[PDB]
Design an enzyme around this catalytic site. Structure first.
Site, short mmCIF file in Angstrom:
data_model
loop_
_atom_site.label_atom_id
_atom_site.label_comp_id
_atom_site.label_asym_id
_atom_site.label_seq_id
_atom_site.Cartn_x
_atom_site.Cartn_y
_atom_site.Cartn_z
N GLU A 115 -9.21 34.33 -72.77
CA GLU A 115 -8.10 33.95 -73.67
C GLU A 115 -8.42 32.62 -74.35
O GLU A 115 -8.09 32.46 -75.54
CB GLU A 115 -6.84 33.99 -72.80
CG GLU A 115 -5.65 33.17 -73.26
CD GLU A 115 -4.37 33.43 -72.45
OE1 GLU A 115 -4.45 33.47 -71.19
OE2 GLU A 115 -3.30 33.63 -73.10
N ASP A 118 2.38 28.54 -77.74
CA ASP A 118 3.52 28.49 -76.80
C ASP A 118 3.95 27.04 -76.58
O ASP A 118 5.17 26.80 -76.66
CB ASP A 118 3.20 29.19 -75.48
CG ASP A 118 3.05 30.68 -75.60
OD1 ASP A 118 2.83 31.17 -76.75
OD2 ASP A 118 3.13 31.36 -74.53
C1 LIG Z 1 -5.19 29.94 -64.42
C2 LIG Z 1 -4.46 31.03 -65.18
C3 LIG Z 1 -4.81 32.34 -65.04
C4 LIG Z 1 -4.14 33.30 -65.73
N1 LIG Z 1 -4.54 34.66 -65.53
C5 LIG Z 1 -3.99 35.81 -66.19
C6 LIG Z 1 -2.51 36.08 -65.91
C7 LIG Z 1 -1.75 36.35 -67.01
C8 LIG Z 1 -0.41 36.63 -66.87
C9 LIG Z 1 0.09 36.62 -65.60
C10 LIG Z 1 -0.72 36.36 -64.54
C11 LIG Z 1 -0.01 36.36 -63.20
N2 LIG Z 1 -0.35 37.14 -62.38
C12 LIG Z 1 -1.16 36.62 -61.32
C13 LIG Z 1 -0.99 37.56 -60.11
O1 LIG Z 1 -1.83 37.11 -59.05
C14 LIG Z 1 -1.33 38.90 -60.51
O2 LIG Z 1 -1.24 39.83 -59.37
C15 LIG Z 1 -0.37 39.32 -61.50
O3 LIG Z 1 -0.56 40.70 -61.77
C16 LIG Z 1 -0.62 38.48 -62.77
C17 LIG Z 1 0.34 38.93 -63.86
O4 LIG Z 1 1.63 38.78 -63.37
N3 LIG Z 1 -2.00 36.10 -64.69
C18 LIG Z 1 -3.13 32.97 -66.58
C19 LIG Z 1 -2.78 31.65 -66.73
C20 LIG Z 1 -1.65 31.18 -67.65
C21 LIG Z 1 -1.61 31.28 -69.01
C22 LIG Z 1 -0.41 30.70 -69.39
C23 LIG Z 1 0.21 30.30 -68.25
N4 LIG Z 1 -0.56 30.59 -67.25
C24 LIG Z 1 -3.45 30.69 -66.02
C1 LIG Z 2 3.97 37.14 -67.70
C2 LIG Z 2 3.41 35.78 -67.38
C3 LIG Z 2 3.10 34.90 -68.39
C4 LIG Z 2 2.60 33.67 -68.09
N1 LIG Z 2 2.28 32.77 -69.17
C5 LIG Z 2 2.47 33.18 -70.55
C6 LIG Z 2 1.33 34.04 -71.09
C7 LIG Z 2 0.19 34.16 -70.34
C8 LIG Z 2 -0.85 34.93 -70.80
C9 LIG Z 2 -0.70 35.55 -72.01
C10 LIG Z 2 0.46 35.40 -72.71
C11 LIG Z 2 0.57 36.11 -74.07
N2 LIG Z 2 -0.03 35.59 -74.95
C12 LIG Z 2 0.35 34.21 -75.06
C13 LIG Z 2 -0.16 33.55 -76.34
O1 LIG Z 2 0.25 32.20 -76.32
C14 LIG Z 2 0.38 34.23 -77.47
O2 LIG Z 2 -0.11 33.62 -78.71
C15 LIG Z 2 -0.07 35.58 -77.45
O3 LIG Z 2 0.62 36.21 -78.51
C16 LIG Z 2 0.32 36.29 -76.15
C17 LIG Z 2 -0.30 37.66 -76.10
O4 LIG Z 2 -1.65 37.47 -76.21
N3 LIG Z 2 1.43 34.66 -72.24
C18 LIG Z 2 2.39 33.31 -66.78
C19 LIG Z 2 2.70 34.20 -65.78
C20 LIG Z 2 2.51 33.87 -64.31
C21 LIG Z 2 2.92 34.67 -63.27
C22 LIG Z 2 2.57 34.02 -62.13
C23 LIG Z 2 1.98 32.85 -62.52
N4 LIG Z 2 1.97 32.80 -63.82
C24 LIG Z 2 3.21 35.42 -66.09
#
Ligand SMILES: Cc1cc(NCc2cccc(CN3C[C@H](O)[C@@H](O)[C@H](O)[C@H]3CO)n2)cc(-c2ccc[nH]2)c1
Ligand SMILES: Cc1cc(NCc2cccc(CN3C[C@H](O)[C@@H](O)[C@H](O)[C@H]3CO)n2)cc(-c2ccc[nH]2)c1
Length: 765
Positions: free
Chosen positions: A735, A538
């Site tokens: 991840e 990304d």
């Molecule tokens: C420190 C950290 C943790 C996570 N955890 C998994 C994750 C995945 C996707 C969306 C969310 C958002 N939220 C948080 C809400 O609290 C939930 O209720 C809600 O369902 C859920 C999905 O929207 N969390 C992802 C990242 C990250 C990766 C790339 C950019 N940031 C970074």
């Molecule tokens: C929906 C959403 C996304 C994100 N960050 C992007 C994101 C996170 C986790 C997994 C992926 C998917 N991954 C990303 C990998 O880069 C791809 O290679 C791979 O195909 C693909 C599937 O595994 N995208 C953050 C939030 C958020 C909500 C609130 C706070 N933060 C919410």
């Protein structure tokens, strides 16, 4: 015979717990049919249960963990849930029984056991939710002999064109059912199993929790209009026990209430088969399913040293089981922008501004419906198909059941449109759309994704050159079947090849660029100032600013992967003119990789741009991108350029961490910057590719044999241990892994391509 091996797969695979988005539910590989789902929650209060009820998968401080300990989609398995908020350790035993001409029968055992901190007398509501979508289908709850509920079994009788006649039994079940003293037990009874039978229009039956809570409200409003007051209120459970109203409908809610430990069974018996399914059937088939899984694992996943110990077998079974247990069946409309606006061409400087204007006309529209049968990255966070993720998912699935992996590849390629495009994110139906922010729903027919599904085809082909267990290997055992599969798919693989060359083309011809070929150059469409979502990496640093003259070595290498597979598949089918054309494209790629992407200054491959002064510049950012020709298996075992890259890989000051290869060199100016997603952390999918190639450059006569054996050995150990340690401590696959600490961070339940470690542990690639 191909159709016969084919009709036997449809029948094996039809039934499953194919709703990975919820803790436990079943549906068949049919769009509009019979779906089940489990809900439970402790009730200690009049207002708590709306907050404690469990249905769709989450991961927060209130849930320790959950996952499949064993699973095979053909047979079933056992799931453990560790619910802190509700003081419960719940077990879901699921098992299939072949018989009939309707993909057979199945049964499930729901077992709840309070943990040591749960009030010994906690009251636990359990709901089993059954819905049936379809036009000429019927489902009816047989009423009970008892006055206000059921003392023993609950019998649902139903029929559909797709399933014919079936009965679905929720049993009495073991466990203390609590009784009430209160006046209210004159009308509702003292406390019993209850069934409500409803109808809503088919398109909302998936909204089980709102449908349930609409009935719990009604029955609470009913107490208030019948003069039942705060002077002497009934117990919370009794207030939240439904008025028995069994009948015919497309929704049946079966509510039990339990004191302490509890257990009950779901027996779905197909009338097409013979005798109906019993709880004695359940216990025999589960025991049997466990021995079988045990025997198949030990053969297919022989853990090599230093990981042969039982602890690593256990970890291996968890990673594998959760990966394959994530398999889902998805049906509905997709949201797609079909304007093909000229701004999506990205041929102007500042093209990202133009492409935003087009998106801001919101021309996207629902189309379909489509189906996808696929594994997922994450049940709580990503219960849906990602294009380049599935290529990694299926490598370990193919080893276990190549016939299953080919069903999933087929399912994906059936989504390919007339131009050759498959959306990188499959969001099929409203159920899928609810887990997805409005901004990421719209798919774009110019947005590509790495074609990793080719790597699975590669493994399929090498194993072709060289009853449920018979079915699992039938498309390699019977070579005429494999060939026929490849013959039907080949034109799709070719259509996608051409789609990359039409839609993701670099500009050689129009700039001061000298190369061995004028045709072979590629640029990822879809990138913003900070991002390139379509590449899968990304936030990996790319040329600044983004520019129509950008060239992307990782895209060029993927085309390379596609051609090597097309040559191999074309040769088997006798596509002699096509093969000659592939061999010309491959040749040109090998050369242009050097002439456009190689940095003699920096000793690695690099993305290219053109200057503020209109000339070609290499933009070098040491990390995963820099190794792509190597990761994708395009460099010759004696390449001086391989030598320079192995250096980079083993260089602890650049990419070599104790926990795996870092996404980006410590020495790069963007190391640990911005969201720092692909800018430092260890990713198991790319580490997997590195490891496989090292083992290959280590099992041939050549000058890097010894170098590549040390790296293979160490990188194998570092990656497996990082993921094992974290699985020991957190119970999760993650991840990515922190390169300073080896701690799992970001998304949990990432099984997912982190489950790629099971293959790494067994070796022999
Ligand atoms: C420190 C950290 C943790 C996570 N955890 C998994 C994750 C995945 C996707 C969306 C969310 C958002 N939220 C948080 C809400 O609290 C939930 O209720 C809600 O369902 C859920 C999905 O929207 N969390 C992802 C990242 C990250 C990766 C790339 C950019 N940031 C970074
Ligand atoms: C929906 C959403 C996304 C994100 N960050 C992007 C994101 C996170 C986790 C997994 C992926 C998917 N991954 C990303 C990998 O880069 C791809 O290679 C791979 O195909 C693909 C599937 O595994 N995208 C953050 C939030 C958020 C909500 C609130 C706070 N933060 C919410």
């Amino acid at each position: 015979l191909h159709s016969e091996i084919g009709r036997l797969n449809n029948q094996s695979l039809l039934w499953g717990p194919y709703r990975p988005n919820i803790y436990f539910g079943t549906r068949p590989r049919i769009g509009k049919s019979l779906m089940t789902g489990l809900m439970w929650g402790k009730i200690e209060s009049y207002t708590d249960f709306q907050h404690t009820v469990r249905y769709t998968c989450e991961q927060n401080e209130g849930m320790k963990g959950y996952g499949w300990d064993e699973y095979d989609p053909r047979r079933g398995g056992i799931q453990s849930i560790h619910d802190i908020q509700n003081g419960l350790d719940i077990t879901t035993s699921f098992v299939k029984i072949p018989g009939g001409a309707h993909g057979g029968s199945w049964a499930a055992r729901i077992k709840g056991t309070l943990n040591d901190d749960a009030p010994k007398d906690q009251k636990t509501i359990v709901v089993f939710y059954v819905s049936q979508e379809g036009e000429n289908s019927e489902l009816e709850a047989v009423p009970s002999e008892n006055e206000f509920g059921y003392e023993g079994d609950v019998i649902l009788k139903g029929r559909s064109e797709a399933l014919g006649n079936y009965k679905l039994v929720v049993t009495k079940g073991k466990g203390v059912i609590p009784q009430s003293d209160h006046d209210l037990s004159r009308l509702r009874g003292p406390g019993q199993t209850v069934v409500q039978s409803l109808t809503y229009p088919d398109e909302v039956l998936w909204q089980a929790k709102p449908i349930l809570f609409q009935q719990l409200k009604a029955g609470i409003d009913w107490l208030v209009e019948n003069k039942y007051d705060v002077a002497d209120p009934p117990p919370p459970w009794q207030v939240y026990l439904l008025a028995n109203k069994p009948g015919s409908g497309n929704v049946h809610i079966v509510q039990k209430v339990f004191e302490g430990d509890f257990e009950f069974d779901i027996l779905f018996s197909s009338e097409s088969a013979g005798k109906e399914v019993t709880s004695k059937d359940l216990e025999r088939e589960v025991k049997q399913a466990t021995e079988v899984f045990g025997e198949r694992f030990a053969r297919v996943f022989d853990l090599k040293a230093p990981f042969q110990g039982d602890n690593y077998k256990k970890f291996g079974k968890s990673m594998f089981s959760n990966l394959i247990g994530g398999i889902g069946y998805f049906y509905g409309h997709s949201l797609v922008d079909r304007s093909y606006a000229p701004e999506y061409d990205e041929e102007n400087e500042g093209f990202w501004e133009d492409a935003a204007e087009a998106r801001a006309r919101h021309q996207e529209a629902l189309e379909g419906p489509y189906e996808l049968f696929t594994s997922i990255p994450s049940r709580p966070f990503f219960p849906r198909g990602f294009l380049w993720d599935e290529g990694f998912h299926l490598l370990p699935i193919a080893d276990w059941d190549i016939d299953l992996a080919l069903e999933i590849i087929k399912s994906w390629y059936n989504l390919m449109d007339e131009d050759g495009w498959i959306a990188r994110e499959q969001i099929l139906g409203a159920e899928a759309r609810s887990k997805v922010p409005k901004e990421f729903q719209t798919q774009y027919p110019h947005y590509a994704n790495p074609p990793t599904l080719f790597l699975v085809l590669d493994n399929f082909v090498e194993r072709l050159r060289k009853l449920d267990e018979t079915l699992s290997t039938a498309s390699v055992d019977n070579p005429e079947v494999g060939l026929e599969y490849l013959r039907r798919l080949y034109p799709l693989l070719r259509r996608q090849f051409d789609w990359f060359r039409k839609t993701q083309a670099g500009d050689i011809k129009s700039y001061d660029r000298e190369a061995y070929s004028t045709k072979e150059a590629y640029r990822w469409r879809g990138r913003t100032v900070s991002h390139c979502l379509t590449s899968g990496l990304d936030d990996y640093p790319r040329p600044q600013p983004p520019h129509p003259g950008e060239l992307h070595v990782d895209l060029m290498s993927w085309v390379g992967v596609m051609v090597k597979s097309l040559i191999s598949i074309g040769s088997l089918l006798g596509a002699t003119e096509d093969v000659e054309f592939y061999t010309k494209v491959l040749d040109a790629i090998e050369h242009n990789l050097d002439d456009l992407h190689w940095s003699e200054k920096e000793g690695c491959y690099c993305d290219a741009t053109i200057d503020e002064f209109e000339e070609h510049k290499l933009v070098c950012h040491k990390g995963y991108i820099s190794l792509f020709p190597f990761l994708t298996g395009l460099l010759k075992p004696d390449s001086p350029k391989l030598g320079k890259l192995l250096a980079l890989i083993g260089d602890e000051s650049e990419l070599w961490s104790p926990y795996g290869l870092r996404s980006l060199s410590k020495k790069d100016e963007f190391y640990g910057t911005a969201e720092n997603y692909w800018r430092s952390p260890v990713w198991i999918n790319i580490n997997y590719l590195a490891i496989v190639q090292l083992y290959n450059i280590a099992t041939q006569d050549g000058p890097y044999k010894e170098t590549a054996r040390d790296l293979y050995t160490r990188l194998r150990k570092n990656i497996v241990e990082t993921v094992y340690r974290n699985w020991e401590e957190t119970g999760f696959a993650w991840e990515q892994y922190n390169p300073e600490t080896g701690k799992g961070q970001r998304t949990q339940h990432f099984t997912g391509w982190t489950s790629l470690v099971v293959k790494i542990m067994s070796g022999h690639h």
